[PDB]
């Protein structure tokens, strides 16, 4: 077979629709997610038109190999989609209604800047290449774009699944390609990060500050150094859940800044001891007493500045 | 081929049955499990009827492509099932008995709220989309729903495998869909959590409380800080076995609450030392003496409140 | 192509044989192992019989699609076997000799109770479902059950590969089913556990006991608490190599019991200090002196009791 | 079918082109990356020629099986490429234009010497082996070599995608082989290594140096030994992201050198204590005072020497 | 199809050749490696003989299904080989030249005894089973055995790729089997183990020995216990890269022996303190002074003995 010929000189319009059945495996490091959906296609092929009466039937059913089917492909899939044709219907005027069901691993970049309070726009790009006989163009049938209410993405809130109606028409290797952008809007469920990372990380930091109510160098060194090690453990744990970004993430910035606090705390603890040994506890006591206020204050201020820069 | 035509204007009833042979790989993080089972289908196709007394055979055997087979699909599978047709039998009155063996990776959400004392209802959804000639409707043949006695799910107790007999009939993209809910009821074997997580976690906590029978700041700091680090290790280990939830889990709450105990123990240890240095050991001794009782008591009470809120 | 019909009222006997070529990937957590073997099948089909003198051959060779082949399946495989037909031979009296080669991931439960001094019986279950014309029954041709001398299972000693000759005949969904049990007997190579887990674990424990020859609370706290943390590391490491069992494993019991020793050691260390501060070193010295003997003795006794309960 | 026979005694020229659609999964340990691209092929087959006037068509379209297609393979792919034929176009003079969409996992060695400030040249090798009738030779059609502007490789900057126009023609197992080198030039986004590994590693080192302003052996031992352990954690973490190389990597050298600093710091801390106990604090104070300068200075000098040797 | 019949009573000789294109993924724990190569086969089938003149061509080209091809299989592959036929050539006398290209995951045992200074002989076993008509025998065509110059195996040096020319002919399940042994000789690049495991491990050990120049029990306990924990971390890290062996590995022995040194060091540190408290520093000083020499000496001697037993 070959493509439906033009009546007048017009491009062939392939109407499309994606209906999400399942969404799973949003992998932050790989920047991929897996989808399981219906793909619907619709186009006019006049060669397939018929008389309702001489057949006695309102619609005709075909097998894929029997008719011409436009070669619709996904741009951003890892390995080309697993596809099962569900139904092919032809109406009297030769309007074809194709329905497949597929599953794919979609590669879509994520913006980690506000992690874990980030929102993402995942994209599924539909595409078609024009042939020599005629030019093919994609369109969105809004009636056939949706998601079943059971669709869930573990650790995320699904906001919407919509399509940008106007295709992106452009030339690639001397042929026209018509590209569609289906968008899945999601936002991260930051809840668990509070009792699992943020709060534990703040507790160990506050514990380090008890060194400001102690004159025991040996105890202070144990406090500050031990808590610093627990901070390293959380830092390492966090970096395991994320890809390496060429920018600072919100959490990443908080985590980095905290190292500076531990470093300055070690200096204070060192200075206090040095002064104590040099028989000048009064200077030492001033620095420690200032530290009790300066540390929580500078910490609270730096965090406000950061939240501001990031949100 | 095409679907069996109606006598009167009835929808076509496809009787279904799932018989579990193997169940494995319950993955808590992915919220999936793998199943290996028989899928049986039964429907009436009059065009296939024949005579027993004369045809020489009480039953006729067909190959999949020889007859019409309803396109039954699973809703919540990750990749569309691996399927091997075992047998196709036709009775004289045109009743078809289809039997396949399949294996699938099923996506079903889990409720972690009571982890590790949780129970789950795993779902396997059967579905069929109606065609233009006729409407297809699913039904459960209870005689063909079961599981072999040997079915085990590592780390879980299998309660039952049953089907909700009433299909969910609804319209999707202007066609009828008929959906069935097969349910696998399981409950977690919490045993191992006791010697592996809970008890070790309580031991390290109780060890931190020995600081209440010591006046040595340097020793107390080592006790409380060291045990806190071991607590972090268990917290980290626990979060590895679970997905991130938008709610607190039972274990998660116990784990979080314990951080508060360590934090307050550091304050007490700090207060006691401060008073000792300020030449007021009698105040310090009162606080420590109260702590010996207040800590186990408030801990035991807080745990009762939590068990109540969660169970 | 239907099954061979009976002479008299007999079921069809399918003779089977499994010959292990390769054995690999015994996964303790998944409770699976992978096999690569020959599967031989043999049955009588009269329709295929011929005269040696007329045909000019004493053996006829067929392609799978040309003749009837019984549908033999494995019960406990994860995904239905990867199969390659090697040869099909027919003798003049119509005896068929089928030979395939396959590889499968077999799910077989393991008894962890005596880990790492455990032995296991892995099972490979062959099965056949009876058809409407005749009943199919499995049998073992002992001549065709074996394993090549080179078969190895990393971290295990291969004892035997045998079959239970008497099939388990039972009814499933109103049809006869004939099941065979091929058994692969293996025993764990416990060697590496001695220098890698057991001995290091005992060393750190004995190191904790040096606290019984010290009056330094600050040092004792460091000794006992540090070694307890290293014990936690080994406990965590061990639980990574094993699935969660609803029973105590040998190693698991030793590991759990050791926590009690650390706990009691912390109490002793605490009691000794308390007495020392209260100006009663003589009482403290008695308790420490008893501890030097009580600890190794109670440890050695408890281990004898455990080894007895488990072996 | 067989290859187009030669007019004169010429080898057959297959023009090639690779156009990157997606690039992902650069795995440093496996030394592999995944690509998703267009592969275009073009060659002269006279047997396919036709008259443009007599035909009325400007172009003829064929299915893969209908004509001879050169067997183009990739040298350095892990598993044989997933390939979907998009279009086959033949012009009046018999010039075929083949276009497929493929995805492959490419094995290409990486030079870790300057990690994480390294740049890499990834290679994709196209190959064709000559047939008995004629010799096949590859060529690059520069018009059909490129990458879509959206191409990204997580944690890397994509510099260029070009082909070495000139094929490597050589003999292998007595037939000619024509090989093409497509090159993807990338450079690592070293940014994240600064707040995640380098700076934390320097902080803990500087913390160890506070021991040079302390006369407390017990405190100094805690400082130096604790920070050394955190250094080990970073070393271990780094080696997880890299394969084992028969050469030192930049980071690897910095990491190794730092161990020497910790070792020498322990010696200094030991020497200082020894002298203090022997009632010679003046000697001890000289060594400590020199250490305060010698350590940062020797560290800064050694790093300059290293950066020089590596860059 | 059936095999070519014998002229006299000879067995059919299938000439073989393996030419390595790529080698990757040497997995020490699984004891597997992945290969990507050419498999060439040659035999003669007189039934395929043709007259160049009557046929037009000097050489004939067939598709696999058109002629008889010997069923060559690999013994030690995990999943039965991914294979694509490149060319089938028949010359006038009926000499067939088969060429495929394949990729496989090969299971070959490794000898870890000298790890990481070990060398290995990896095996690829080709096999063929005889049929009833005639006996098939394998042979090596040395002209078709090799590896491309670019073949690399990450973390290993490739020594040679050769075949044992003499097949192993034997009987299995009443038929003849002809087996060939292709050998890939490799040796481990031990370099990285020196700065990453060995040296760091020695540094921490030497750090523990500084306790022999200190009279501070509290400091000595911190030194020895802390370094022992870092030793455990390296031990654990090492055991991750290796399967569990029923024998001691070189590294494994060094690692185990070091535990004894830590243990004895703790005893010395304990003895020294005990004597100090009992008002006998002179005895304590003798033991410490001997320790300073005995420890490095016994360590250096024990390592020579080990190096001797293993090399
Ligand atoms: C450690 C330091 C404190 C860290 C907490 C930062 C939270 C934050 O700042 O995150 C902010 C986000 C919501 O922001 P948004 O939805 O992006 O709004 C963007 C709209 N603007 C740009 C117009 C403003 O989180 C939350 O609603 C819940 C925060 C609970 C934090 C509990 C601790
Ligand atoms: C330290 C804090 C203590 C933690 C212990 C929590 C156990 C618990 O309290 O959980 C209770 C669960 C059983 O509850 P269920 O089967 O879900 O019943 C739900 C039915 N309702 C809805 C009517 C309530 O476990 C057990 O059978 C007992 C295990 C003993 C735990 C030993 C420690
Ligand atoms: C910490 C305490 C030490 C733990 C060691 C327990 C080992 C054990 O006692 O386990 C027993 C196993 C053998 O088990 P079996 O072959 O099933 O014999 C059961 C036979 N009955 C039922 C008749 C009694 O030991 C060994 O072959 C060697 C163990 C070397 C241990 C070195 C440390
Ligand atoms: C720990 C001690 C610090 C180590 C930092 C060394 C980085 C370096 O020195 O590397 C420099 C590289 C650039 O190298 P290039 O692009 O390959 O230039 C090759 C040109 N030649 C061949 C002439 C030399 O990165 C940078 O410009 C930014 C480095 C910021 C590091 C901040 C910390
Ligand atoms: C703790 C002590 C450190 C252990 C170092 C043992 C190295 C060794 O002794 O190993 C020796 C192997 C080479 O062995 P081969 O090539 O297999 O020789 C087998 C042939 N014979 C048996 C006939 C001799 O490595 C080396 O080239 C030396 C590496 C030096 C690393 C130093 C740090
Ligand atoms: Cl696609
Ligand atoms: Cl499905
Ligand atoms: Cl099977
Ligand atoms: Cl390829
Ligand atoms: Cl094979
Ligand atoms: Na300490």
**What ligand has the least distance to the C-alpha of B255?**
2
B121 and B236 share one domain: no
C287, containing H or E segment = helix C281-310
What values do phi and psi take at A243, rounded to 5? -80, 165
Residue identified by tokens 């696999």 is E64
A170/A214 same-domain check: no
Phi, psi (rounded to 5 degrees) for E17: -160, 135
What gap in Å lies between CA B16 and CA B4, rounded to an integer?
17
Q: Which DSSP string do the residues of B5-24 spell out, in sequence order?
A: PPSSSPPEEEEEEEEEEEEE
**Cis preceding-peptide flag for E116 (omega within 30 of 0):** yes
Report the C-alpha gap between E85 and C255 in whole angstroms. Answer: 56
| C136-140/C12-27 β-pairing | parallel
Q: Do B215 and C270 touch (CB under 8 A)?
A: no
- Please tell me whether residues A270 and A198 are part of one structural domain: yes
The CB-side HSE value for D226 (13 A sphere, CA atoms) comes to 28
> What was the elucidation method?
X-ray
Residue C188's contacts (CB-CB under 8 Å, 6 or more residues apart) are C115, C116, C117, C118, C119, C120, C155, C156, C157
Where does residue D120 rank: exposed (0-12), middle (13-18), buried (19+ CB within 10 A)?
buried
Q: In angstroms, what CA-CA distances link B204 with B76, B200, B211, C221?
A: 43, 6, 12, 13
Token match 């992945």: residue? E34
Which ligand ends up closest to the CA of C196? Answer: 3
Please state, in angstroms and rounded to a whole number, the distance separating the CA atoms of residues A72 and A127: 6
Per the document, the length of chain C is: 311
- CA separation, residue B145 to residues B162, E33, E306 (Å): 7, 44, 64
- Cα–Cα distance, A244 to A92 (Å, whole number): 56
Q: In chain A, what residues touch B170 (CB-CB under 8 Å)?
A: none
User: How many CB atoms are located within 10 Å of the residue C19 CB?
Assistant: 19
Q: Are residues A14 and A120 in the same domain?
A: yes
A67 — phi, psi (to 5°)?
Answer: -120, 170
Closest ligand 1 atom to Cα of A201: 1
d(Cα A105, Cα D82) in Å, to the nearest integer? 15
Same domain, B74 and B184: yes
* Inter-chain CB proximity B218 and A215 less than 8 Å: no
Q: Which two tokens stand for residue E293?
A: 């020499």
Cα separation, C66 vs A287, in Å, equals: 94
Q: Phi/psi at E215 (nearest 5 deg)? A: -100, -5
Cβ neighbours of residue D130 closer than 8 Å, sequence gap 6 or more: D11, D136, D175, D176, D177, D178
Nearest atom of ligand 2 to the alpha carbon of B114? 17
The bridge status of strand E146-147 relative to strand D32-44 is unpaired
Sheet of E73-74, strands arranged across: E73-74, E119-129, E175-188, E156-172
Torsion of the alpha carbons at A205, A207, A210 and A212, rounded to the nearest 10:
-20
Cβ of E218 and C213 within 8 Å? no
Chain D residue numbers touching E237 (CB-CB < 8 A): 236
Residue of B219, B215, B243, B182 whose CA lies nearest to B38: B182
The enclosing domain of E107 has a CATH number of 2.70.170.10
Cβ atoms of B38 and B101 closer than 8 Å: yes
Cα separation, D189 vs D176, in Å, equals 41
Cβ distance D206 to A270 less than 8 Å, yes or no, reads no
- Cis peptide bond prior to C116, omega within 30° of 0: yes
Report how far residue C35's alpha carbon sits from residue E27's, in angstroms, rounded to the nearest whole number.
18
The CB of B164 under 6 Å from ligand 2? The reply is no
Same domain? D240 vs D264: yes
Instruction: Give the span between the Cα atoms of A25 and A34, in whole angstroms.
Output: 6
Range of the domain at D297: 193-311
Strands (E), chain E: 12-27, 32-44, 60-61, 73-74, 82-90, 95-107, 119-129, 136-140, 146-147, 156-172, 175-188
**Ligand 4 pocket: which of D117, D235, D309 to mutate (most atoms <8 Å of CB)?**
D117
- D23 three-class SS: strand
D82, D144, D218: residue with CB nearest A79: D82
Q: Resolution, rounded to a tenth of an Å?
A: 2.9
Q: Note whether B248 and B206 are same-domain residues.
A: yes
Please name the residues in contact with A111: beta carbons below 8 A apart, sequence gap of 6 or more: A118, A120
- The domain boundary residue, chosen from E163, E192, E221: E192
Residues A86 and A147 in one domain: yes
Angle subtended at Cα A292 by Cα A290 and Cα A298, rounded to the nearest 5 degrees? 85
Residues E185 and E267 in one domain: no
Could you tell me which residues come within 8 angstroms of residue A285 by beta carbon, excluding any fewer than 6 positions away?
none
Residue A179 is encoded by which pair of tokens?
A: 């590209």
- E187 within 8 A of E171, measured Cβ to Cβ: no
Q: How far is CA A293 from CA A255, A271, A290, in A?
A: 21, 17, 6
Instruction: For residues A174 and A202, state if they share a domain.
Output: no
Ligand 8 centroid–CA D83 distance in Å is 29
Ligand nearest to the CA of E188: 5
From the list A79, A232, A266, the residue facing D103 with the nearest CB is A79
**β pairing state of E73-74 and B82-90:** unpaired
Specify the ligand 2 atom closest to the Cα of B119: 17
Answer for the pair B175, B48: CB distance below 8 angstroms, yes or no: no
Q: Which of A115, A145, A154 to mutate to test the interface with B (most CBs of B within 10 A)?
A: A154
CB contact under 8 A, B230 and C232: yes
Determine the Cα–Cα distance for residues A65 and A85; give it in Å rounded to an integer. Answer: 11
List Cα–Cα distances, B53 to B57, B58, B94, in angstroms.
8, 8, 15
Measuring CA to CA, which residue among A188, A198, A32, A196 is closest to residue A114?
Answer: A188
Split into its structural domains, chain C has a count of 2
Q: Where a domain ends, among C165, C192, C219?
A: C192
Instruction: Name subunits touching D (3+ CB pairs < 8 A).
Output: A, E
C76 with B216: Cβ contact below 8 A:
no
Q: How far apart are CA B241 and CA B239, in angstroms?
A: 6
CATH (domain of E289): 1.20.58.390
- Residue closest via CA to ligand 3's atom 10 equals C117
Cα dist. B10→B4, B13, B42, B133, B140 in Å?
11, 9, 16, 11, 18
- Partners of C153 in the β-ladder: C156
Minimal C-alpha gap between C209 and chain E (Å): 10
Tell me which residue has tokens 């200096």.
Answer: A267
Backbone angle region of B173, left / alpha / beta, with phi > 0 → left and psi within -120 to 50 → alpha: left
Q: Is the CB of B30 under 6 A from ligand 2?
A: no
Please give the structure tokens belonging to residue E147: 């590896």
Q: Are C152 and C21 in contact (CB under 8 A)?
A: no
Q: Closest Cα partner for C262 from C283, C234, C286?
A: C234
Min Cα–Cα distance to chain C from E149, Å: 32
Contacts of B77 (CB under 8 A, 6+ apart): A36, B104, B105, B106, B107
Residues of chain A neighbouring D196 (CB-CB closer than 8 A):
235, 239, 244, 252
CA C240 to chain centre: 17
Question: Measured between CB atoms, which of A19, A207, A234 is closest to B263?
Answer: A207
Residue B213 phi/psi, 5-degree rounding, is -120, 20
Q: Is E110 left (phi over 0), alpha (psi -120 to 50) or beta?
A: beta
DSSP E10: P
CB contact under 8 A, A192 and B244: yes
- Residues of B in Cβ contact (< 8 Å) with C252: 195-196
Rg (CA), chain C: 31
Query: Quick check: B32 and B62 in contact, CB under 8 A?
Result: no
C80 neighbors B82 (Cβ within 8 angstroms)? yes
If we measure between CA atoms, which residue out of D288, C202, E245, D200 comes closest to residue A239?
D200
Which residues lie with the beta carbon below 6 Å from any ligand 4 atom? D 117, 194, 198, 254, 303, 307, 311
Listed in sequence order, the DSSP H helices in chain D are 52-55, 193, 199-208, 217-240, 250-277, 281-310
| Distance of residue E174 Cα from the nearest chain D Cα, in angstroms | 36
Subunits next to B (3 or more Cβ pairs <8 Å) are: A, C
Q: Residue E6's CB: how many other CB atoms inside 10 A? A: 13
Q: Are D156 and D145 in contact (CB under 8 A)?
A: no
Q: Is the CB of B168 under 6 A from ligand 2?
A: no
Same domain, A115 and A176: yes
The reply to whether residue B195 touches residue C256, judged by beta carbons under 8 angstroms, is: yes
Burial profile D142-161: b = 16 or more Cβ within 10 angstroms, e = fewer:
eebbbbbeebebbbbeeeeb
Probe site for chain D from A244, A251, A267 (most D CB atoms < 10 A): A244
Neighboring chain B residues of A21 at a CB cutoff of 8 Å: 75
Q: Of D192, D225, D256, which residue constitutes the final position of a domain?
A: D192
**Distances in whole angstroms, Cα of residue D39 to Cα of each of A80, D68, E285:** 15, 17, 79
Q: Give the C-alpha separation, A156 to C70, whole Å.
A: 49
Secondary structure element (H or E) that encloses residue B273, with its range: helix B250-277
Q: Are B123 and B17 in the same domain?
A: yes
């Amino acid at each position: 077979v070959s493509p439906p010929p033009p009546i007048a000189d017009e491009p062939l319009t392939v109407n499309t629709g994606i209906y999400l059945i399942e969404s799973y495996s949003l992998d932050d490091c790989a920047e991929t997610f897996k989808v399981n959906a219906f793909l619907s296609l619709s186009w006019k092929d006049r060669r397939l038109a018929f008389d309702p009466v001489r057949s006695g039937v309102r619609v005709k059913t075909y097998e894929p190999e029997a008719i011409w089917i436009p070669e619709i492909r996904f741009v951003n899939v890892e390995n080309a989609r697993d596809a099962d044709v569900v139904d092919i219907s032809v109406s009297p005027d030769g309007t074809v209604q194709y329905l497949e069901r597929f599953s794919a691993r979609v590669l879509s970049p994520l913006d980690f800047r506000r992690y874990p309070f980030d929102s993402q726009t995942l994209h599924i790009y539909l595409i078609v290449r024009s042939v020599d006989t005629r030019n093919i163009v994609l369109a969105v049938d809004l009636e056939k774009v949706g998601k079943n209410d059971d669709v869930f993405l573990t650790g995320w809130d699904i906001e919407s699944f919509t399509a940008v109606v106007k295709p992106a028409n452009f030339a690639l290797e001397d042929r026209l390609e018509s590209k569609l952008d289906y968008q899945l809007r999601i936002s991260r469920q930051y809840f668990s990060y509070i009792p699992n990372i943020i709060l534990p990380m703040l507790f160990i930091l506050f514990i380090s500050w008890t060194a400001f109510w102690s004159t025991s160098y040996e105890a202070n060194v144990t406090l500050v150094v031990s808590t610093l090690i627990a901070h390293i453990a959380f830092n390492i744990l966090v970096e395991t859940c994320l890809p390496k970004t060429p920018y600072m993430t919100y959490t990443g910035a908080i985590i980095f800044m905290i190292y500076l606090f531990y470093f300055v705390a070690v200096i204070e603890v060192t200075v206090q001891h040095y002064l104590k040994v040099e028989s000048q506890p009064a200077r030492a006591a001033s620095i420690t007493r200032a530290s009790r206020i300066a540390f929580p204050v500078v910490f609270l201020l730096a965090n406000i500045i950061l939240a501001f820069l990031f949100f």
